[PDB]
Amino acid sequence: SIWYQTNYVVPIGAPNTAYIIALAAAQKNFTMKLCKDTSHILQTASIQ
């Protein structure tokens, strides 16, 4: 969760609404196992 600690302070002339971009990654102790088929995709029938 992302909470406003103090506020977003802005002077005269600069715009009101800003934006934050979130970028996710993995560490050097990441490990995966038990290879499977992908879940979060489908496919329509009758290709071509």
Partner 1 sequence: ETILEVNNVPTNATSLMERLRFPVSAQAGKGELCAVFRADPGRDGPWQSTMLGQLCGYYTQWSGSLEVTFMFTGSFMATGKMLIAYTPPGGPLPKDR
Partner 2 sequence: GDRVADVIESSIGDSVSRALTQALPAPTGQNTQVSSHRLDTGEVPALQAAEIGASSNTSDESMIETRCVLNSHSTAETTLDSFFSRAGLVGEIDLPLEGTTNPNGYANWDIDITGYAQMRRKVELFTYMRFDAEFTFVACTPTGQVVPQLLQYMFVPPGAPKPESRESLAWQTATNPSVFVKLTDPPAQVSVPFMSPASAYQWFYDGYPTFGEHKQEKDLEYGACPNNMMGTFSVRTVGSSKSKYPLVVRIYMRMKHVRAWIPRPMRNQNYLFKANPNYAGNSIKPTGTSRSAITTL
Partner 3 sequence: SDRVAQLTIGNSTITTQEAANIIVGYGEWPSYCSDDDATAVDKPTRPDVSVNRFYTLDTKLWEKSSKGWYWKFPDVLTETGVFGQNAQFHYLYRSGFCIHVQCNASKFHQGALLVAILPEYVIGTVAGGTGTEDSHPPYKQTQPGADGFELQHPYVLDAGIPISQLTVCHHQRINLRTNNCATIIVPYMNTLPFDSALNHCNFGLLVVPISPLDFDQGATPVIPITITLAPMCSEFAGLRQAVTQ
Q: Which of 4-12, 13-21, 40-48 is the region at the interface with partner 2 (rule: CB under 8 A)?
A: 40-48
Q: What's the distance, CA 44 to chain centroid?
A: 27
Name residues whose C-beta falls within 8 Å of residue 18's C-beta, 6 or more positions apart in sequence.
8
Residues 1-48 that bind partner 1 (CB under 8 A): 1-11, 14-27, 29-41
Cα separation, 33 vs 27, in Å, equals: 16
- Give least dist CB 43 to partner 3, A: 37
Residues that bind partner 1 (CB under 8 A): 1-11, 14-27, 29-41
